[PDB]
């Protein structure tokens, strides 16, 4: 309850045949459904109105908290400051009018995933490469482990997603903040995500790197993501 | 059969005169022929206009609990890192390749297609070493590169990043498109209603608790937009 935004310390060197990660050691994708105002006087009119996502401004919140090198981080050397958060990081966001659609891929198909996680069902050796059986909706917060799931480029017709993975022992975190940067969400046809049932879906994973305790134990550190989505009224044909 | 997407562990320090790599230690180019709908006043060919592509399962490398050497005492597993190669091609013919070897005296094993009758010149440029990427899991990545002297009907893109500790850096988005049209506004023309997709996505080396290293690869997705082009002959 004190280390909100951290994982349980990382286990290492599990046999591929005996790999049973703790639930609290596994970062999961974040998701929220944002209710939007009803636009429709009625649902009988020839044309109806739907919210259309046009742009998103987004950034990671609290990046300067990593300038705390006094709280619990291993000294870099004798008399030195604490070790910065560093190592493998993943920065991902999606905006859609439907839940994010995901494809399952595993490091280890024999991993025994714990209760409270949703992971690829009936995994095979093919699950370590591409097994098209592993399709999920990001339909639950704090459930889909980041290590099991990626955004599915074969689907997500009504979602725009953006991710960067930087892997490595000592990878430096590099994070930008500005309220002047906008990502356009309109497709080739000039249409943004259309918000079905007056619902906007925001999804994120922001693993900033590993925190190192004085012992050498490592914990994932995550930070919140802000979304500001510009929406416009789009006329559609009444499907009823 | 349990470590699909991994190579056999890397041998090291073979004599150049006695270099016999194990077949399952050698990553190969991936290729597939995609059959297209049959089209045939003027004859019609499918023309590849754009490709959307990304590496699938990049987040699987956040598993630092399965079998990777601890970074230090009490630490998490070592991330996949080191030399990586990210390559894709889209064409209306099989990818055309040029052979170049680290060591012309390498004895390549049965099941690989590698430069035939190699000489010392095969370590630089030997124009004898021409191949079609005409078989999946056969042409070792270390022996072959896309041939810039050919591939008139293919578009190819590759980045090699070499080094012990190179970090994998991989982007995913369904908003990025690569245009396949040439200077004349003509994309690859799909001969015999066939589209050819080719890839190599070596992400880096996985390190076991022993310090042994294995190549990790990931699948590549392709979405190709095609249009009907009127052609003569």
């Amino acid at each position: 309850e004190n280390l909100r935004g951290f994982s349980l310390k990382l286990s290492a060197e599990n046999d591929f045949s005996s790999d049973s990660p703790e639930r609290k050691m596994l970062p999961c994708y974040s998701t929220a459904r944002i209710p939007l105002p009803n636009l429709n006087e009625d649902l009988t009119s020839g044309n109806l109105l739907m919210w259309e996502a046009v742009t998103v401004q987004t950034e990671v919140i609290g990046i300067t908290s990593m300038l705390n090198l006094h709280a619990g981080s291993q000294k870099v050397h004798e008399h030195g400051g604490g070790k910065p958060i560093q190592g493998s990081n993943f920065h991902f966001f999606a905006v859609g009018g439907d839940p994010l659609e995901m494809q399952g891929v595993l490091m280890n198909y024999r991993t025994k995933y714990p209760d409270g996680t949703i992971t690829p069902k009936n995994p095979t050796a093919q699950s370590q490469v591409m097994n098209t059986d592993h399709k999920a909706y990001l339909d639950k917060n704090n459930a889909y482990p980041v290590e099991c799931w990626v955004p599915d480029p074969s689907r997500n017709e009504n979602t725009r997603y953006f991710g960067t993975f930087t892997g490595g022992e000592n990878v430096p975190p590099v994070l930008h903040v500005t309220n002047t940067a906008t990502t356009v969400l309109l497709d080739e046809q000039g249409v943004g995500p259309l918000c079905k049932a007056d619902s906007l879906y925001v999804s994120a994973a922001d693993i900033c790197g590993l925190f190192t305790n004085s012992s050498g134990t490592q914990q994932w550190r995550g930070l919140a993501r802000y979304f500001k989505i510009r929406l416009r009224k789009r006329s559609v044909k009444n499907p009823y | 059969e349990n470590l699909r997407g991994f190579s056999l562990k890397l041998s090291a320090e073979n004599d150049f005169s006695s270099d016999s790599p194990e077949r399952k230690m050698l990553p190969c180019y991936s290729t597939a022929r995609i059959p297209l709908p049959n089209l045939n006043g003027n004859l019609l060919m499918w023309e590849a206009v754009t490709v959307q592509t990304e590496v699938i399962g990049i987040t699987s490398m956040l598993n630092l609990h399965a079998g990777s050497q601890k970074v230090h005492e009490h630490g998490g597993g070592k991330p996949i890192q080191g030399s990586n190669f990210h390559f894709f091609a889209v064409g209306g013919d099989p990818l055309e390749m040029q052979g170049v070897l680290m060591n012309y005296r390498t004895k390549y094993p049965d099941g690989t297609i590698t430069p035939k009758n190699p000489t010392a010149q095969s370590q630089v440029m030997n124009t004898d070493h021409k191949a079609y990427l005409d078989k999946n899991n056969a042409y070792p990545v270390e022996c072959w590169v896309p041939d810039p002297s050919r591939n008139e009907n293919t578009r190819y893109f590759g980045t090699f990043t070499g080094g012990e500790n190179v970090p994998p850096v991989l982007h995913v988005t369904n908003t990025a498109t690569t245009v396949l049209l040439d200077e004349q506004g003509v994309g690859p023309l799909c001969k015999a209603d066939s589209l050819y997709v080719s890839a190599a996505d070596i992400c880096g080396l996985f390190t076991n608790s022993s310090g042994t290293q294995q190549w990790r690869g990931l699948a590549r997705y392709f979405k190709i937009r095609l249009r009907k082009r009127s052609v003569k002959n």
Partner: antibody, heavy 121, light 109 residues
């Protein structure tokens, strides 16, 4: 360069306890599964059992619950105890590792010198 | 336990010839977890092949393994004088680990 050094009393009378120790002189003690084998004179080999650095063991049912394997992480040593020995326990006993803690894909070939164990009255 | 049978018991060939050794299992060996060992008199076993076909660190390329399930082959492409010793197969797909009884390769004279 992982080096296994083997020792212990080879000469036993029936009903006595075989006690062998293997020292890991070079290489990481925590990175491998540590295994015991035996080879009776002019026969093939028998798998006795194995242990990891946390002391998790698996044994061959053939030894009828007479076998114990232990680790000493401070000394980087692992030991075999075989109870109630008889003539059929006469063999060269070997310590070894066949794979790392990453699993059977990461296969190795490090063997001790072997110990001739003779069981006879 | 899985029982391994080796054929032939004794194989007689000349140096430079191809040797074919058979290992057959009483049941399917999970994941083709089949290893080939060489034993020279007075020495511990020496690993040649693991995972049915994977050549071990530093082993000459004249040694190759093939097969899956119940049926496995060690091939020595061109016999050297030092190769005329004993060969054992080991299955590690099922607990307990079990060895075959071994094949001796003798010089035909």
């Amino acid at each position: 360069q992982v080096q296994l050094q083997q020792w212990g009393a080879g000469l036993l009378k029936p009903s006595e306890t075989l006690s062998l120790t293997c020292a890991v002189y070079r290489g990481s003690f925590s990175a491998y599964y540590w295994t015991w084998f035996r080879q009776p004179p002019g026969k093939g080999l028998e798998w006795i059992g194995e242990i990891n650095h946390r002391g998790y063991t698996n044994y061959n049912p053939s030894l009828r619950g007479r076998v114990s394997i232990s680790v000493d992480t401070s000394k980087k040593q692992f030991s075999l105890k075989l109870r109630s020995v008889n003539a059929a326990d006469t063999a060269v006993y070997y310590c070894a590792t066949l794979r790392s803690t990453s699993g059977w894909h990461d296969y190795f070939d490090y063997w001790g010198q072997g110990t001739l164990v003779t069981v006879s009255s | 336990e899985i029982v391994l049978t080796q054929s032939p018991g004794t194989l007689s060939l000349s140096p430079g010839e191809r040797a074919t050794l058979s290992c057959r299992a009483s049941q399917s060996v999970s994941s083709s977890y089949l290893a080939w060992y060489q034993q020279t008199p007075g020495q511990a076993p020496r690993l040649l092949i693991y995972g049915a076909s994977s050549r071990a660190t530093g082993i000459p390329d004249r040694f190759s393994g093939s097969g899956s399930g119940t049926d496995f082959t060690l091939t020595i492409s061109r016999l050297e004088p030092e190769d005329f010793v004993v060969y054992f197969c080991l299955q590690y797909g099922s607990s307990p680990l079990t060895f075959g009884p071994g094949t001796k390769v003798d010089i035909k004279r």
